Ligand SMILES: COC(=O)c1ccc(SCCc2ccccc2)c(S(N)(=O)=O)c1
């Protein structure tokens with residue numbers, strides 16, 4: 001039902017998911033002038049040396065690259081987090097044009113796309129239990145700008161033609177997510193939500209300041225995916241981003257400067 005089309009997009013979601021108008025919704029604009037440096041934040045620890053990718057799925061809205069999260073393999077800790085968060089999947093949001101596509105904005109700047117690495121807090125045992133908790137998930141958000149190609153993204157771009165339509169999947173083993181990180185792990189953090197239904201208020205957002213560069217050709221290939229299933233009229237998968245939501249009673253903290 002819900003999507004990003006002309007009649008089922010973000011402004012409609014509240015009708016099936018009333019939390020869409022909640023107190024800690026994501027994404028948000030990051031006002032860099034008002035984000036406060038927090039000397040008590042730790043450096044982020046991203047430990048992806050043992051990550052085990054399995055499969056890539058066109059989920060009907062984006063594509064998920066899925067990881068084996070049955071053991072402590074690929075974990076995020078440190079930064080603003082307590083305990084250990086296990087990577088379960090990553091996906092992106094992107095635009096129909098380079099001037100839009102990110103969910104978070106920075107001083108109202110939209111990036112071409114935004115990568116989300118989703119992790120769940122191991123103290124809750126599994127992802128389904130974790131999304132029921134205010135500290136259940138940590139999502140690491142990375143902006144994409146269009147410029148030089150990102151070599152470590154090419155393996156993702158090249159498998160997209162095999163999962164063009166909703167519900168298609170493909171084997172996707174041995175992919176190393178370290179190739180999608182920028183040089184600096186300086187970040188902003190704030191408490192928020194999933195940005196798609198069910199919009200649960202269970203996420204500690206960590207958004208890296210430094211964007212990665214991808215080529216125009218790479219993001220053009222994202223835009224050839226389809227929201228529709230096989231044998232249905234083509235709906236290009238573009239503009240699958242939720243706009244900035246009210247910050248309300250929240251502080252965005254900076255790990256730097
Ligand atoms: C276009 O965006 C997506 O396709 C997308 C898919 C998954 C997720 S996270 C898991 C959401 C979920 C689904 C079902 C049950 C409990 C949680 C997100 S985000 N931006 O991290 O909120 C976006």
Ligand SMILES: [Zn+2]
Pocket residue numbers: 091092093116195
């Ligand atoms: Zn997302």
